[PDB]
Symmetry: D2
């Protein structure tokens, strides 16, 4: 209760799975939230399922859309006042090795997972700096920002990029006394309705050679680390990586 | 409020600075706490300053004392019921390079910072495994478990050891379904009454070439990450390192 | 002598500084080498300065140019036989924070430093797999693939991407028995004619708070680690990062 | 040929497996070598198998024996002149989890793997500093200095300690202009006569979920990275970790 009192958050890809759980817990802790998706049908339903409009709203936007990012911040501030918190959660995957990645696949994934995170981080710093908000940018950067996977080549590129670009942003914000922190969160495998629709995936993710806990996580596992990072409890954490992975990367 | 309801925690070196703040926040969140120190004069005063005995007690014990560790767990369970949470926070430093470290200094520091953490982790696993407690062992492993410092040679050895030994323990507990998680916390420089008594230290720690935020942290900065790790909010986090350092290691 | 006997190497940006030294040592160790640059005036002069045409040639190509990559491999094989070794060394920098990076700057840097490395790695795997060549792809991925720099935001993104994308490629090549290794090299600051033309840069790079050795490196420092990685001496090294930085990242 | 001309090296545990291969390649490259073991029967045979006495000798010494370390340096200098190079390779393992490690096991393993490496590094700095030797201390610090293993608890502690203590030493030597570098080498699984005597071990080590190359390494794989680190080719490498692991840690 009340751990995010006063905060105003944007959560990209906030309509499903991890993003939806972040949104849910953010509201529970007193934040106002704007969630996004490119699909209005998913997004309108998502917001109402979490709370009322004084709590949470939806804004249609593809995170790869640079100009839209500006529209999104303006809509959030109109609704709730100045934005304090940004969670760059929208992302896609391609199940190709580097060798078998088409250039179109490469460009499409980087547009969402890398360009989109850049656009959001850049704008967030500009919009949040120097306002006494206790501002926090949380970038989703994966276990696949630490280790490779032979069939996630472009995804690995994007997650390693986010991991280190976030450090750059963290450092500049700290050195300039901007009152903006930047950190990354690195989920392991998480159970969602989507993973459920991939036959055998959860079982495969749960083998001990993959996740030593022997099972995969839940959306709220990622929500709770995001609450900590969004809150003023984490006012001395910047430039760091927060891993919640069931032991995946420990072996 | 209530984030640690039902938990029973031991915090070594829990009478001052970081440990005292962990203890304070743990009680605030509903945990019962046993704090330790080798000095009874510091410890008795510390516990009363935080809460009443149904909340928090003191047990005299040097973490390097293997047999005492057993006494400590028994006293904690007598007071509060079965222990769920262990924070291995006791530690010392020597301001010597590797070259200038005496063997006596080496052995003394390893006895507290490495042997003590081993004894606590080993016993904690034995005492906590298989009880449905949502058990959590939090080992303090420093920014100096990631980077070297030319004048902290033995300290660096100890912190690197804790960092990776904790992964081992995490993995075995996960693979065996013990219901015990093991993680490390890595503070940067934190302001305490002790740092204050070291002339020039805070200023030195606050230079941008050291801590990019331009200031050092506070004890509660470490308390709040420990609350997260002790709580069931972090049930999918094991084998990982949680850094709260003002950007120190990001550059 | 003879450590690269039989090898046929492409070195992008092989006409100056680090790339030129890699080329020089590669020839000295028996490799045939094709160096590239987008500028024919630099490139033709560079090759002749190292050796004769049976040893080393130049091919004009911007590493961001996807179609050219194909032309480059064909020209190298025409000259020297099947390519065994690729050093993705071409790169650019922008001295902007994330906040102050224009979208045009972002795209331009990623085109060279990320897309170019992807194109080369992807093609190299296809062209080198399954030929008994002891093939090796060496990707230049910087100290700035480990730590952030407040004024190198896009560069940091690119280097973190290369760092982890290379692991993906390494893993897939290993799992498929392709006889291709992929590793990254991470230079610290190196003295070149270019650094010399940046007033104050070497001195700034040589402060102990930056490079603890108190001086910066030389091009041959990077050449020698590349010889090791190109050679069959390193036949069990894949998916790893090789740092040569004067201690920069150790503190 | 000649890459270690003039060098005088001590290699602890230099009589078998990895250490023996390091010794072999060091002699081939022009170094004089003193190898150690606690067992004179293994050691005398080992030296003669590599070369003559003007090349390589044996000195009986347990690396956990502090006073002996002094005897060892004196004997090496008597034979060959001032020592330039130290490879701290002696080590033991215990196949126990943290939970199941006895205190006697803990102390015994730390005595060799941690205390021994400390004693050698400390003495090496004192004996090598300020002599224009291009001195290099190479500490064997394992894949198990990066990742945990549930059945190698004490070993993990020791290897994480070596990993970070070496950074400390590297930094102090660099800052003080000692002309001593300190780096760590991190082998994955390597085939030796000992591994061969552990039924099923190589096959187990070679599963793709362990070593993605699908096989384990050979002793010379570690020898060649040590030649690079001992040589002046690596004069700008200090405080770094060199991993040769078949992809083990990349996934
Ligand atoms: N689910 C897992 O097992 C898992 C594992 C590792 C990492 N991750 C990462 O965690 C993050 C969140 O996962 P998730 O559960 O919300 O994903 P999800 O699999 O449940 O669904 C995909 C999500 O991505 C968002 N999205 C995709 N493309 C978008 C675009 N162009 N614009 C805006 N939004 C877009 C959608 O809103 C959607 O919620 C992602 O970045 C993902 O890469 C997830
Ligand atoms: N204060 C900082 O700036 C800082 C910076 C980096 C890391 N750390 C680490 O954080 C942890 C906690 O710091 P702190 O503020 O509580 O320390 P502190 O400097 O305030 O005081 C030392 C603490 O260590 C404990 N301690 C020392 N030796 C002990 C022994 N033999 N047995 C039991 N307890 C013992 C004491 O209880 C005391 O509270 C330590 O492990 C320390 O190494 C602290
Ligand atoms: N010089 C340093 O201090 C330093 C420090 C850290 C990292 N690095 C990295 O090391 C690598 C090599 O450095 P360097 O000394 O050769 O660089 P350099 O500064 O001496 O010169 C730039 C080099 O990049 C190449 N290049 C740039 N854009 C290119 C393009 N579009 N197509 C083809 N080639 C292109 C050129 O051939 C040129 O040799 C680079 O990737 C750089 O990012 C260098
Ligand atoms: N062989 C592998 O698969 C493997 C895998 C990972 C790490 N390592 C590490 O690599 C290093 C070298 O391996 P190896 O092949 O030489 O070992 P080995 O298994 O072949 O034989 C053990 C070696 O350790 C030395 N040794 C053990 N205790 C000693 C003591 N008290 N004093 C002096 N010397 C002692 C012996 O000389 C012997 O050569 C070791 O530190 C080991 O921990 C080996
Ligand atoms: C790593 C995770 O995001 C994932 C990617 C592709 C397919 C399944 C899971
Ligand atoms: C790293 C921190 O624990 C410290 C150690 C010695 C002196 C001051 C601070
Ligand atoms: C990191 C190195 O490549 C660099 C980048 C920009 C300016 C100077 C040096
Ligand atoms: C990690 C390696 O040194 C090992 C340890 C114990 C048994 C087998 C192999
Ligand atoms: Mg640093
Ligand atoms: Mg792994």
């Amino acid at each position: 209760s009340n751990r995010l009192d006063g905060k105003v958050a944007i959560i990209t890809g906030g309509t499903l799975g991890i993003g939806l759980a972040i949104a849910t817990k953010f509201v529970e802790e007193g934040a106002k939230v704007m969630i996004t998706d490119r699909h209005s049908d998913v997004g309108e339903k998502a917001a109402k399922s979490v709370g009322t409009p004084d709590q949470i709203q939806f804004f249609q936007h593809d995170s790869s859309d640079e100009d839209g990012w500006t529209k999104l911040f303006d809509a959030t501030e109109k609704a709730f006042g100045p934005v304090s918190t940004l969670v760059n959660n929208a992302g896609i995957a391609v199940n190709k090795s580097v060798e078998e990645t088409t250039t179109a696949e490469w460009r499409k994934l980087l547009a969402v997972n890398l360009d989109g995170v850049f656009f959001g981080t850049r704008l967030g710093i500009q919009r949040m700096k120097n306002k006494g908000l206790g501002a926090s940018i949380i970038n989703m950067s994966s276990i696949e920002g630490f280790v490779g996977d032979p069939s996630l080549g472009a995804y690995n590129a994007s997650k390693g990029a986010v991991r280190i670009m976030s450090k750059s942003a963290a450092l500049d914000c700290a050195l300039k006394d901007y009152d903006v922190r930047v950190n990354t969160v690195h989920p392991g495998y998480i159970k969602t309705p989507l993973v459920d629709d991939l036959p055998g995936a959860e079982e495969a993710m749960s083998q001990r050679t993959k996740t030593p806990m022997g099972h995969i996580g839940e959306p709220n596992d990622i929500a709770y680390i995001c609450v900590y990072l969004a809150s003023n409890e984490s006012k001395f954490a910047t430039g760091s990586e927060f891993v919640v992975d069931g032991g995946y990367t420990a072996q």
